[PDB]
Amino acid sequence: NRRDLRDPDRTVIASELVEHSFGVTLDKHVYAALKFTDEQRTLDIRDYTKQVLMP
């Protein structure tokens, strides 16, 4: 603050120290899910690593 020098009133405006904050939340669940019948897994899958896991 500023006040006039040699001012008849001698009051001072006390300043405030306010700490702020914000929250960071873990709030999402990203997933990839696959369903294979016994026929699909037995007959239609050949590698399962370059055909299921890599995709």
Binding site: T42, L43, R46
Partner: protein, 54 residues
Amino acid sequence: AHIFVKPELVAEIGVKQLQREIVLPGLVWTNPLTDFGGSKNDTITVRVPAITTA
């Protein structure tokens, strides 16, 4: 009278519930085709060779 405490024993001696004999599976042309995966519609084509005439 004498009285004794005995274990009611159980044995398997080879009496089996009567069920019919299995003959047909051995008498039929079984599994000449195996690679049924990696074949469209689970269908394997069988090729019958050509016949020519002299």
